[PDB]
Amino acid sequence: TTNHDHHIYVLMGVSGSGKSAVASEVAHQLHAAFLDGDFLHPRRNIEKMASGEPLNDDDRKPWLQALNDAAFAMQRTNKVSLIVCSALKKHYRDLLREGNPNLSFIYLKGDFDVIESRLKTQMLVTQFETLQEPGADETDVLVVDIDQPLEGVVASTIEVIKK
């Protein structure tokens, strides 16, 4: 039931890296399916998040699981699928990869100053702390330079789904 011709792109990166804005535009340009993963967070996680707490590994497990099922669902009937999901850790990425050999990552990149100077500084401090940038041991990960205008980021995102 995996359609190896079909593909899922997880747009990943810290909060404020413009993930949603990119995925939406790219998806309209490409007529792709699009799922903002924030929406799948379980009520508990949002309470915690909204209250001002940063989540941990076990808060995210059930969420990542939910993204995994939705990628599977989406690759059934869409040639190209986009999922916004921060996927900060390598272990989280692995959870998304399971049973999804046709799923890969677009890492919308930038460092602390760019992002901050793009915009709660603390939230942002903790994301970068949690971020584990994917090394040479993750073959299915492409990177986009977000130190550019939205339109250029979208286009680089496009040239990478089409490369």
Contacts with a copy of itself by CB under 8 A lie at: 1, 24, 27-28, 33-36, 38-43, 46-47, 49-50, 66, 69-70, 72-74, 76-77
Give least dist CB 117 to Cl ion, A.
Answer: 13
Distance between CA atoms of residues 69 and 115, nearest Å: 31
The first and second tokens of residue 98, run together, are 């399971």
Nearer Cβ to a copy of itself (68/134): 68
Return the closest-CA partner of residue 36 out of 53, 51, 19: 19
14 annotated ligand-binding residue: yes
Distance between CA atoms of residues 160 and 158, nearest Å: 5
When binding is defined by CB under 5 A, the residue of 17, 68, 104, 127 that contacts Cl ion is: 17
The first and second tokens of residue 5, run together, are 């011709």
19 binds, options a copy of itself, Cl ion, none, Cβ within 5 to 8 A by partner type: Cl ion
- Following DSSP, what letter does each residue of 9-24 receive, concatenated? EEEE-STTS-HHHHHH
17 binds, options Cl ion, a copy of itself, none, Cβ within 5 to 8 A by partner type: Cl ion
90 annotated ligand-binding residue: no
Give least dist CB 110 to Cl ion, A.
Answer: 11
Give least dist CB 17 to Cl ion, A.
Answer: 5
Q: How would you class 153 by CB atoms within 10 Å of its CB: exposed for 0-12, middle for 13-18, buried for 19 or more?
A: buried
Positions at the binding site: 13-20
